[PDB]
Amino acid sequence: HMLLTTSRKPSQRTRSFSQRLSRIMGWRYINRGKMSLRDVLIEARGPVAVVSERHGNPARITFLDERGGERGYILFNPSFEMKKPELADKAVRVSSCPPGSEGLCNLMGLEVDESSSRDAWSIRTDEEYAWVMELMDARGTPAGFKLLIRDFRVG
């Protein structure tokens, strides 16, 4: 459902993160090289997400519609282990979006699925972050991949 890319000249960590996330989501990943956003949108022919950084860390995901309108954005810090997540499917499901988190689900195109928590996201509150989005793997246990959400805005 989406093309993912990064801001221009990303660090190794931003690359690793974004390649990982796009695999998890089943989104098509492209190297940003030296393209403008306009040229990214031409290549995508469809919606795009851009992972941008501050100080060499991924810090924001911006979501665009196919014409380049900004759907919204998420400010976050990633938390991921070295081991590849074990997934049997695109992680396009979420177990629940509690009140106040619906925009996370809308931006990322997640569908609520109460039948199982495998290959799925869990959204919860945290003492430090606004939300933690944690990937549950093909066995429904923590995949070692989280989005630590500081804020998000839609529209």
| Distant-in-sequence, close-in-space partners of 90: CB < 8 Å, separation ≥ 6 | 24, 25, 26, 119
Count how many residues are written for the chain. 155
Question: How many helices and strands (H and E) does the chain possess?
Answer: 3, 10
Solving technique? X-ray
Q: What is the rounded distance in angstroms from the CA atom of residue 154 to the CA atom of residue 32?
A: 24
Q: Is 20 exposed, middle or buried (0-12, 13-18, 19+ CB in 10 A)?
A: middle
Q: What is the rounded distance in angstroms from the CA atom of residue 26 to the CA atom of residue 79?
A: 19
Q: What is the rounded distance in angstroms from the CA atom of residue 1 to the CA atom of residue 47?
A: 7
The domain locations on the chain are 1-155
Beta bridge partner(s), residue 3: 28, 48
| Distant-in-sequence, close-in-space partners of 26: CB < 8 Å, separation ≥ 6 | 1, 90, 91, 92
- The resolution, in angstroms to one decimal, equals 2.0
13 touches 39 (CB < 8 A): no
52 touches 58 (CB < 8 A): yes
Find, among 74, 146, 83, 135, the residue nearest to 104 by Cα. Answer: 74
Q: What is the rounded distance in angstroms from the CA atom of residue 132 to the CA atom of residue 148?
A: 5
121 touches 133 (CB < 8 A): yes
Q: What is the rounded distance in angstroms from the CA atom of residue 46 to the CA atom of residue 75?
A: 23
In this structure, how many other beta carbons lie within 10 angstroms of the beta carbon of residue 134? 18
Q: What is the rounded distance in angstroms from the CA atom of residue 121 to the CA atom of residue 98?
A: 12
3-state class (DSSP) for residue 86: coil
For residue 97, give both structure tokens: 């979006």
Q: Phi then psi for 103, rounded to 5 degrees?
A: -65, -35
The vertex-81 CA angle with 27 and 131, nearest 5°, equals: 70
Sheet of 93-94, strands arranged across: 28-29, 3-6, 48-54, 57-64, 70-80, 142-154, 131-136, 120-124, 93-94, 111-112
The third-level CATH classification (topology) of the domain covering 1-155 is Rossmann fold (3.40.50)
Q: What is the rounded distance in angstroms from the CA atom of residue 123 to the CA atom of residue 143?
A: 14
